[PDB]
């Protein structure tokens, strides 16, 4: 019977603290320097309070519905308040309680990405309602489908750290919301914290301190760097000079782009994904609320590119047995489509429910 | 003969860096955004210099007097400058040098909590004198009594990470001192850093990356979140709206409240402790220098509640053999009382000694 | 055949994230609060973009030329884009991919130290050219000589974490460059981040979570603290009062001074090195661009003092067999001299090449 490895326990608990650091204060500071000064305090309050709400919903029923055994779309309710999970229960090579915390940290950053961007224009009570609906009906089922043995995973979708679950999912929610910089040193500080916490996000997704964690770690350094250069070169070409916001945006583009691919590609693939993601991101914001321009566009680019660069011939870990690059590409596309529609429909429902109960537009 | 486990060494060294992060720059930034602008530089200087002083006193004789074998109140002087501690000496499952650093990091945050709050009104030289007296005669004996096999531990007091040693101890010292916000984004940043470093503080108190570290980790996420919501709801009820300072204060209330309990309670207990701590904290600051309103009140609440929620029937790890909830509650109360009086008497002595030598009131 | 230890993998990946944190955003924030307000954005852009460039040059050929087997001055080109390094290859007790990332993080901070200081006065394109020349012809050969089995290591030079490779190397480059505070809370924040990341820098240099990592960890806490006090006392004596910039400068002086010595000396030696480094640093800045006043002076002091305090009789780990303190001192001096000249000559070449291609002085 499975025994926890202390080295993996240690690594995963530290990785969880790093992911929590991405929201508190990472994302808050990032949006904080971008949005209008008069809306900063309110946004920081919303991100903090909704972060708390997510942590609680996660432990009450979130983890159970996302990672319990159920069907292709959701888990079960046998782990309410983590009941029936023995303190010494092991999941993979770490204590299950660590997996609960690590996974909860991902739900938090996903919600932070949406709330930080929409805080300016949405009523507080309407954001709490939306978070509850969307975490429950979109984040949870998609996490289950992708990482909880659901539909997408059962079809062999490759998404190491959340191009779909986190990025495209939050990007679409923010976009439906939108449809319905005074402090650049602060934006830089938030970007830097997002970057450092992201090593916990990407490398921790291996669930162990092995060679895959090491690969994902190096690929994160490489893709982020390649994207910064890619964005900056494009900015210099289109605008005549680079800018700090451009440099920070490029870093996020590469981080988002490498998210689904990091544990599956070679360093060469990471370099190519980073450059393409940096340029696509720039193209994106050209054609806050760039809660798609970057996260959506780069998330899609990253997910598609994972279906290419995971190939052995291109330095990746290799596709599963009996899977050609063509089949994998098709599965990546179907996963992106399902995520976009699922999140969009649920977000619409969430916003509409808030709008019908308390009103969306801030009074 | 005991052998160090590298996984535990790794976890404990990273946890120590996280605790050091709580002071430098966590607490400094927290008070920095709260106190008057004209006093910020001076306060940051005092926190930095006194942090250095504590690190040195700790290695010179602090660790030895707190953790050496002595009597019920203090250790010994056989570990001056860590003499007689072989580099390869193991304490528990890690190298003793790691335990020296981890424990020293706790002395630093405790002193940071007091200095950051009083810097505005106290003379520099008077704070150095006070720190020396209080670290030596209050922090050290209380650490010894609680974690160094002294009086309180010998009576079975439950205090996982320092409700008494750190929180009530610093709260009372700050209060005796008091008796004798221009930058809210900065307060938020300090709160966020305190939060992230606190995982090292609470989970590292297990001394190993096991299921107790995992439990303390999850309980920290849960209590902090429950307290944020608790404080915010109370604020909305009493004041009509939440505020950023309220959200940050709630987070600290839950973090302080869960400190003594984190490695002993179940997640349900963490949720209850967090809510009660958030509300008590709000009540507290209602009826800087809230270096009691929160740390004192929440520290007492947390310590008392540890005597309840540690029970097996309430999802805790269970009280020691032959100990009823009633007996445990009595021991918690006696530990709180002893800490309050011990710190108060020593703080009085420290402040008076400074006042008689250089004068307390800043010139 | 060598097997990776997961505890060491975990420790080294977290230590690498901590070193990356030193540059992004550590050094950027430090210089950010020091330089003129009108130059902050541009400097943050330069540090971010050059950080990206270093990460890419490192993976493309940097790691191979620095750590591949070659001659006394450089490695080889058999590891271009990390080709021929099996994902499961082990170096020491960790996966080689982790060593690539850890070592790359050191190249980044070294370049960050120079760029952050010179950004104000140097043209963007000229800094990119200089970085490429200097990383390639100075950082790489010196890293190889000291940590890649080259000339200095072959002569028994003691430099645990980079007094020569990082500190004196960057100090001289910045000085040749120079030859050719509006936000003190921000300087403090950057200092604090540099401090916390420095535990990854120093303790991670052991390459494993053992007693040497533990020793280096404690020595870092002690030297930093001793230097803060040393600088502050000197400042109080010369200037009548301490200052925040003085406190922060002292911390960096001790951190730099203990860099080459941390894994070789006893705590007493760390205390002595910290005090001497704090005072020397103060003397230094007395007789930004203090990219020598502190890093150069303290780096030299630290390197010389490592040749003294590594001795068993003074509490150190002991010199290698057949090596007297006299011989060691001579080797330390020769290593310092070689680094100063090598970096100076290459920096001159780098700046001149930029000056002849695009012009150095910002337009």
Swiss-Prot record, chains A, B, C:
Annotated site residues (Important for the deprotonation of the ammonium cation) in this chain: 159
Cytoplasmic side, ranges: 32-42, 120-123, 238-243
Effect the entry attributes to changing residue 295 to E/F: Loss of transport activity with methylammonium as substrate. Shows normal GlnK-AmtB complex formation after ammonium shock
Cross-referenced Pfam families: Ammonium_transp
Effect of residue 147 to A: 2.5-fold increase in transport activity with methylammonium as substrate. Shows 80% inhibition by thallium
Annotated site location: Twin-His motif. Important for optimum substrate conductance: 167, 295
Annotated residues for binding of NH4(+): 205
Activity control: In the presence of high extracellular ammonium concentrations, transport activity is inhibited by interaction with the regulatory protein GlnK. Ammonium transport through AmtB is required for GlnK sequestration. Formation of the GlnK-AmtB complex is influenced by intracellular pools of the effector molecules ATP, ADP, Mg(2+) and 2-oxoglutarate. The rapid drop in the 2-oxoglutarate pool upon ammonium influx and a simultaneous, but transient, change in the ATP/ADP ratio promotes AmtB-GlnK complex formation.
Topology, Periplasmic side: 1-9, 68-96, 149-162, 206-212, 265-266, 311-325
Gene Ontology terms: cellular component: plasma membrane
Domain of life: Bacteria
Record keywords: Ammonia transport, Cell inner membrane, Cell membrane, Membrane, Signal, Transmembrane, Transmembrane helix, Transport
Mutagenesis or variant effect for residue 167 to T: Loss of transport activity with methylammonium as substrate. Cannot form GlnK-AmtB complex after ammonium shock
PROSITE patterns cross-referenced by the UniProt entry: AMMONIUM_TRANSP
GO BP terms, alphabetized: ammonium transmembrane transport; carbon dioxide transport
Membrane topology, record value: Multi-pass membrane protein
Effect of residue 361 to A: Almost loss of activity
Site, as annotated: Important for optimum substrate conductance: 201
Effect noted on mutating residue 167 to K: Loss of transport activity with methylammonium as substrate
Keyword Hydrolase: no
Gene3D superfamilies, sorted: Ammonium transporter AmtB like domains
Protein family membership: Belongs to the ammonia transporter channel (TC 1.A.11.2) family.
Subunit: Homotrimer. In response to elevation of the extracellular ammonium concentration, interacts and forms a complex with GlnK. Interacts with GlnK with a stoichiometry of AmtB(3):GlnK(3). Sequestration of GlnK is reversible.
Domains (record comment): The C-terminal cytoplasmic domain plays a significant role in normal function and it might also mediate co-operativity between the three subunits. The C-terminal cytoplasmic domain is also required for interaction with the T-loop of GlnK.
Name assigned to this protein: Ammonium transporter AmtB
Organism from which the protein derives: Escherichia coli (strain K12)
């Amino acid at each position: 019977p499975a025994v926890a490895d202390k080295a993996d326990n240690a690594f995963m608990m530290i990785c969880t603290a790093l992911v929590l650091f991405m929201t508190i204060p990472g994302i808050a500071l990032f949006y904080g320097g971008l949005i209008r000064g008069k809306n900063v305090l309110s946004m920081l309050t919303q991100v903090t309070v909704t972060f708390a709400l997510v942590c609680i919903l996660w432990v009450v029923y979130g983890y159970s519905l996302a990672f319990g055994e159920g069907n292709n779309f959701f888990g079960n309710i046998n782990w309410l308040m983590l009941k029936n999970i023995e303190l010494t229960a092991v999941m993979g090579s770490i204590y299950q309680y660590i997996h609960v915390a690590f996974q909860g940290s991902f739900a938090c950053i996903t919600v932070g990405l949406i709330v930080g961007a929409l805080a300016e224009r949405i009523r507080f009570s309407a954001v709490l309602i939306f978070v509850v609906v969307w975490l429950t009906l979109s984040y949870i089922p998609i996490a289950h489908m992708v990482w909880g043995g659901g539909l997408l995973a059962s079809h062999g979708a490759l998404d190491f750290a959340g191009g779909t679950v986190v990025h495209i999912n939050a990007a679409i929610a923010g976009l439906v919301g939108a449809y319905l910089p005074h402090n650049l040193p602060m934006v830089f500080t938030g970007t830097a914290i997002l970057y450092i916490g992201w090593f916990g996000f990407n490398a921790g997704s291996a669930g162990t301190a092995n060679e895959i964690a090491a690969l994902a770690f190096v690929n994160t350094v490489v893709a982020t760097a390649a994207a910064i250069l890619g964005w900056i070169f494009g900015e210099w070409a289109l605008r005549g000079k680079p800018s700090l916001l451009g440099a920070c945006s490029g870093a996020i583009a590469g981080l988002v782009g490498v998210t689904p691919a990091c544990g599956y590609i070679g360093v060469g693939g990471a370099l190519i994904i980073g450059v393409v993601a940096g340029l696509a991101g720039l193209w994106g914001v050209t054609m806050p609320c760039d809660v798609f321009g970057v996260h959506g566009v780069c998330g899609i680019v990253g997910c598609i590119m994972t279906g290419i660069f995971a190939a052995s011939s291109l330095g990746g870990v290799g596709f599963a047995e009996g899977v050609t690059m063509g089949h994998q590409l098709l599965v990546q596309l179907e996963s992106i489509a399902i995520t976009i529609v699922w999140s969009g429909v649920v977000a619409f429902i969430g916003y509409k429910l808030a709008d019908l109960t308390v009103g969306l537009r801030v009074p």
